[PDB]
Design a protein around this ligand. Structure first.
Ligand SMILES: [Mn+2]
Ligand SMILES: [Mn+2]
Ligand SMILES: [Mn+2]
Ligand SMILES: [Mn+2]
Lengths: 243, 246
């Protein structure tokens, strides 16, 4: 099912209002440090389905060791359908509740930055789920997407695929430049033995260049370890109650 | 796991039925250089539901040859009266496959396959009478055993020397024989495709020679798994998904 236009119209209005609070530069001392000295805790989130039955997961990993120091998985009911450009309106209230639970249970494990599976400013109205989560919690957030959201002239055509071929080693990047001339994100080759890139964008309180480089440092495999461990735990949490 | 009194009975039945195995070619297409006259190849599968030991789906497919297109398919949810015991695979699944073959005979007798590829060994077996022999003897159809892992019987071992021989298999179609302590050839390891490295283990079920079984298995491989066994797998899983409503 798809929401009526009157509902999407309210949602667009809310995205435009909250967009004013996005901060697209570094605001934390570790972010300006050549090796991120002072960064100790990286968060990742996930919301998986068995709809209605879904699992929202939050993990916190140590940095740079990338070991899980916190995990929480909660069975939730998301009735909102998926509409591209409105991902936050189906999951962000449950992700906020997970952050609030962490604050009440293990406040010293509050992450210094959260990797979100979905875009930040690379978005139809420049305000993706990673921005939305960052503004509601005021945590620094990075958007990490597996496919390219085709907005502002960006398209996964042959020219885009040629640039992907030029990504040869882990850490290699190319910028996603919209028709406006704005840089919306970066395509990142996240490790040496993978060819399909990550699409990284700013959520909140971080610069793009820092966001890219940290994402790279969190990649044992293609998927950054915080997002990957949240994915694993949400489906393994499902296996425990179902089956 | 069944008590030894039940396994003893099963060994006795394997010994009785083994007498009817025919380990040579008895069909004209088999002795043809290009299997001309072969038109229908069967594949079977029995897949179990995740979390339910007892409920399983038995599937029979028939493919055209050489085009390898599905021309018949049938699935049935079944109740399993025995757990998996290595060496007794037939006593878990053969009753359901026989009933599937009989249903084909009653509904589309002109689509009866000329040979069946079975996911499991034939004579490469603890007592020389694996599920592929067992199916072949109960239906009198020619059958080929195709296994993914090496059943370690009569001196066969998936040791370092075995892994070395797998390395010497260079392209699709390359083989080496599986030799028992007695010196007899129990089956072949076959590299079934160019873009795979893990071999198939091929053995005679019934009414076919090993060399013919190996060459036919190879010709049914679009991917690593021979297309009749692969389409039966796909169908069982798709049928399970639908019975669950998903
Ligand atoms: Mn995820
Ligand atoms: Mn997933
Ligand atoms: Mn199978
Ligand atoms: Mn399987």
């Amino acid at each position: 099912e798809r929401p009526p236009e009157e509902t999407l119209s309210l949602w667009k209005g809310e995205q435009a209002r909250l967009k004013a609070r996005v901060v697209d530069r570094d605001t934390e001392a570790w972010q300006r440090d050549p090796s991120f000295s002072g960064l100790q805790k990286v968060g990742g989130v996930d919301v998986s389905f068995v709809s209605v039955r879904a699992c929202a997961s939050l993990v916190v990993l140590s940095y740079p060791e990338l070991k899980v120091v916190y995990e929480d998985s909660r069975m939730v009911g998301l009735k909102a359908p998926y509409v591209s450009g409105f991902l936050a309106f189906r999951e962000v209230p449950f992700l906020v509740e997970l952050v609030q639970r962490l604050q009440e249970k293990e406040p010293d494990l509050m992450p210094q930055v959260v990797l979100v599976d979905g875009n930040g400013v690379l978005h139809q109205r420049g305000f993706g789920v990673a921005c939305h989560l960052g503004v509601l919690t005021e945590l620094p957030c990075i958007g990490v997407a597996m496919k390219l959201l085709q907005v502002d002239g960006l398209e996964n055509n042959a020219l885009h695929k040629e640039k992907i071929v030029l990504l040869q080693a882990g850490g290699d990047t190319f910028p996603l430049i919209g028709s406006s001339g704005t840089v919306l994100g970066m395509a990142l080759r996240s490790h040496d033995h993978s060819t399909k890139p990550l699409y990284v964008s700013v959520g909140h309180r971080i610069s793009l260049e820092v966001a890219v480089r940290l994402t790279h440092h969190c990649c044992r495999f293609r998927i950054p370890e915080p997002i990957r461990q949240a994915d694993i735990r949400s489906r393994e949490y499902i296996r425990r109650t179902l089956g």
